[PDB]
Amino acid sequence: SELKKINIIENLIKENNFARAKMLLNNLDLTTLIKYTELSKTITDFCEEAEQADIWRTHLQNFNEEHFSFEEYPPLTVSQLVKGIYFYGQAAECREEEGKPFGDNELEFLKKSAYQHCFYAYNSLSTWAYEKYKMGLNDYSLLTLHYAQKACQYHWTPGYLLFYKTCLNLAILSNAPSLSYQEALEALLIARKLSEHQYSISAINNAYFGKGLIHGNESWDKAISETIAKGKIPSTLLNKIYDKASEKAKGILDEFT
């Protein structure tokens, strides 16, 4: 029984048979393991401790292919990374079955994936909200930028590149696009100032599946120059934006030293 099988691992953790509970947890498929952490406070708390991180790394290493391997980087934990990848994979299968993009099932898995702060989910959800906004639903632009902003909290350069691209797409549909282009420039500059950090290099690996920053979104100076030209950003505001980007990027690089 499902209720009986959960109580078996729950009691092992309560009886302090940690090696025995960890032994049974490793035999589970990822679907059942994740489902147990959702149905049991005892299981999920045990699976979030430091010595249980190898349970998730085994599943993370199963996702690795021949010419691509996922990499870990803070602030996200290894369980958030594995659950986010799994729920996003379930969303991709839901789209294959329904036949249309962003069905109810796919959106449900995308939000569970975004709850684990998966970059793929934030990227796909921002596209979903942008198309909603583009077809006339005005307040969905709020969700579009929110999902891109959350990607900045956890995914370093690819996150800020998503926020930068989201601001460009919102500027296209805006009648006063100056503020959108100014916000796009700041996020674009921050993405460059973070592109050298080790954790951001791993984020670029995961976000674009090892295909690099060029085969995912042309050149740094080319993109910066076109944002300033398209946005008609005056020279007075440039120094303010460059200073804000350097200040916010410095606080990020100092926290991860």
Side-chain angles (χ1 to χ4, degrees), residues 1-214 216 219-257:
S1 174
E2 177 203 86
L3 289 175
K4 183 61 190 304
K5 289 165 185 174
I6 293 182
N7 297 333
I8 295 170
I9 304 189
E10 281 190 7
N11 295 342
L12 290 177
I13 300 176
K14 297 174 181 177
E15 302 278 44
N16 303 124
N17 285 284
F18 304 117
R20 196 179 306 173
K22 183 173 175 177
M23 165 189 174
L24 289 183
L25 285 164
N26 282 329
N27 296 332
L28 296 177
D29 50 311
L30 187 51
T31 298
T32 307
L33 170 64
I34 294 180
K35 183 162 158 298
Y36 281 10
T37 63
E38 296 180 348
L39 293 179
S40 172
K41 174 186 174 58
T42 302
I43 304 310
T44 178
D45 295 342
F46 178 73
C47 291
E48 291 303 325
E49 297 173 1
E51 56 276 2
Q52 271 63 255
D54 63 279
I55 299 179
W56 304 105
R57 289 197 179 87
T58 298
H59 291 290
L60 180 66
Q61 290 167 340
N62 284 128
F63 286 117
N64 296 336
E65 298 158 343
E66 196 182 47
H67 289 87
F68 168 66
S69 298
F70 290 96
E71 303 182 13
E72 311 175 37
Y73 56 93
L76 289 189
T77 68
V78 64
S79 74
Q80 294 177 312
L81 178 60
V82 172
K83 294 177 186 175
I85 293 168
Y86 168 82
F87 286 139
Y88 185 79
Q90 294 300 110
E93 296 185 11
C94 285
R95 174 178 298 199
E96 178 81 289
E97 189 169 14
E98 285 208 18
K100 77 171 194 175
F102 301 119
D104 290 343
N105 292 338
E106 178 188 348
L107 286 172
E108 187 162 298
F109 277 114
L110 283 180
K111 292 180 180 178
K112 299 173 65 62
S113 183
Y115 185 87
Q116 303 292 327
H117 308 298
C118 179
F119 173 85
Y120 308 136
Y122 284 143
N123 182 32
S124 182
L125 282 174
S126 65
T127 297
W128 163 75
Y130 178 75
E131 296 299 329
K132 293 274 181 180
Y133 172 61
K134 185 179 181 182
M135 73 173 179
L137 302 185
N138 294 74
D139 60 348
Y140 271 85
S141 63
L142 277 54
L143 288 182
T144 312
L145 199 60
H146 171 69
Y147 291 137
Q149 175 175 350
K150 273 294 179 181
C152 298
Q153 295 188 21
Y154 310 101
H155 299 290
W156 292 82
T157 289
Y160 280 92
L161 283 183
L162 172 62
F163 192 94
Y164 145 79
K165 190 60 182 181
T166 300
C167 291
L168 294 187
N169 294 5
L170 290 176
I172 297 302
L173 305 177
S174 176
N175 290 318
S178 179
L179 277 178
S180 305
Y181 281 114
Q182 297 170 206
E183 284 287 325
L185 175 61
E186 177 180 344
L188 178 57
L189 296 177
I190 296 175
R192 189 180 190 181
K193 296 175 179 302
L194 297 179
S195 59
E196 302 278 31
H197 197 285
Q198 170 192 343
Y199 297 154
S200 179
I201 294 294
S202 297
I204 298 175
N205 172 85
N206 294 12
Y208 313 119
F209 308 101
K211 279 181 291 185
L213 196 136
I214 275 74
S219 176
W220 283 116
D221 294 325
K222 292 275 193 164
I224 296 171
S225 296
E226 290 192 10
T227 298
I228 298 177
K230 286 177 182 178
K232 302 183 179 65
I233 308 178
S235 308
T236 306
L237 276 67
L238 282 182
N239 293 321
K240 186 63 59 59
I241 296 177
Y242 273 86
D243 287 21
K244 288 175 59 181
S246 298
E247 188 186 276
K248 296 177 181 177
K250 176 179 175 56
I252 293 177
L253 299 176
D254 291 339
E255 196 180 302
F256 301 93
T257 180

